[PDB]
Short mmCIF file of N, CA and C in Angstrom, two decimals:
data_model
loop_
_atom_site.label_atom_id
_atom_site.label_comp_id
_atom_site.label_asym_id
_atom_site.label_seq_id
_atom_site.Cartn_x
_atom_site.Cartn_y
_atom_site.Cartn_z
N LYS A 1 0.75 -1.11 0.06
CA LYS A 1 0.12 -0.01 -0.06
C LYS A 1 0.92 1.20 0.05
N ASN A 2 1.15 1.68 -1.16
CA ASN A 2 2.19 2.86 -1.44
C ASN A 2 1.15 4.21 -1.31
N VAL A 3 1.07 4.76 -0.11
CA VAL A 3 0.26 6.03 -0.08
C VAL A 3 1.18 7.14 -0.35
N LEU A 4 0.88 7.88 -1.29
CA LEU A 4 1.62 9.07 -1.62
C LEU A 4 0.65 10.26 -1.57
N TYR A 5 1.27 11.54 -1.55
CA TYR A 5 0.55 12.70 -1.54
C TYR A 5 0.86 13.64 -2.61
N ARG A 6 -0.16 14.20 -3.25
CA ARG A 6 0.18 15.11 -4.37
C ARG A 6 -0.63 16.52 -4.02
N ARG A 7 0.35 17.47 -3.74
CA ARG A 7 -0.25 18.77 -3.33
C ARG A 7 -0.59 19.64 -4.54
N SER B 1 0.06 -1.11 -4.75
CA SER B 1 -0.85 -0.23 -5.28
C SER B 1 -0.48 1.35 -4.86
N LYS B 2 -0.44 2.06 -5.97
CA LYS B 2 0.02 3.51 -5.75
C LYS B 2 -1.25 4.33 -5.49
N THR B 3 -1.34 4.82 -4.35
CA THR B 3 -2.40 5.69 -3.99
C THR B 3 -1.95 7.18 -3.90
N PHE B 4 -2.52 8.13 -4.85
CA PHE B 4 -2.10 9.51 -4.82
C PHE B 4 -3.19 10.21 -4.09
N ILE B 5 -2.95 10.79 -3.01
CA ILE B 5 -3.90 11.58 -2.17
C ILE B 5 -3.52 13.06 -2.50
N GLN B 6 -4.46 13.78 -3.19
CA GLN B 6 -4.24 15.04 -3.43
C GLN B 6 -4.64 15.97 -2.33
N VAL B 7 -3.75 16.79 -2.00
CA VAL B 7 -3.96 17.88 -0.93
C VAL B 7 -4.01 19.28 -1.48
N UNK B 8 -5.10 19.89 -1.69
CA UNK B 8 -5.26 21.20 -2.20
C UNK B 8 -4.75 21.06 -3.76
#
């Protein structure tokens, strides 16, 4: 589960 | 699974 964030 | 959480 690769949780990434994009602002 | 690549989850891209958008923040603003």
